[PDB]
Amino acid sequence: KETAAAKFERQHMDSSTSAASSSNYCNQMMKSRNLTKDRCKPVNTFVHESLADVQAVCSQKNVACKNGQTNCYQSYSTMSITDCRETGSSKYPNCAYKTTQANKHIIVACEGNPYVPVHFDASV
């Protein structure tokens, strides 16, 4: 099985580009990050910043998570991100996604020692 931290990295980190490179970015990334294996994961966000900058968010603005948990943190700065969302033509096993690039604050939930991101809650 995957550690919670490693799963966050697999699902949410893309430090290799500064932004989504094409409208097919999400189709390519959801596949290669193994998010279309058993089914199409409906919604997923990738963050185009260094792993260090994303981990640092766990020391930034403490805010509530959407479910009311107290261990969420909002980035003080905006970050380059890409929202991937299933589109009408999508149907497992042929997953299809819309790519939406944006620059926003991210909100993540953190856990553990070291205290690192384990869930992507939202972006604002």
UniProtKB/Swiss-Prot annotation:
Substrate binds at residues 7, 10, 41-45, 66, 85. It is an enzyme of class 4 (lyase). Changing residue 12 to A: Loss of activity. GO terms for biological process: defense response to Gram-positive bacterium. It catalyses: an [RNA] containing cytidine + H2O = an [RNA]-3'-cytidine-3'-phosphate + a 5'-hydroxy-ribonucleotide-3'-[RNA]; an [RNA] containing uridine + H2O = an [RNA]-3'-uridine-3'-phosphate + a 5'-hydroxy-ribonucleotide-3'-[RNA]. Changing residue 119 to A: Loss of activity. It is found in: Secreted. Disulfide bonds join 26-84, 40-95, 58-110, 65-72. GO terms for molecular function: lyase activity; nucleic acid binding; ribonuclease A activity; RNA nuclease activity. Pancreas. The active site is at 12 (proton acceptor), 119 (proton donor). Its EC number is 4.6.1.18. GO terms for cellular component: extracellular region. Transmembrane segments: none annotated. Keywords: Disulfide bond, Endonuclease, Glycation, Glycoprotein, Hydrolase, Lyase, Nuclease, Secreted, Signal. It comes from the Eukaryota. Glycans are attached at residues 1, 7, 34, 37, 41. Endonuclease that catalyzes the cleavage of RNA on the 3' side of pyrimidine nucleotides. Acts on single-stranded and double-stranded RNA. Belongs to the pancreatic ribonuclease family. Interacts with and forms tight 1:1 complexes with RNH1. Dimerization of two such complexes may occur. Interaction with RNH1 inhibits this protein. Monomer. This is Ribonuclease pancreatic. It comes from Bos taurus. The gene is RNASE1. The chain holds residues 27 to 150 of 150 of the full protein.
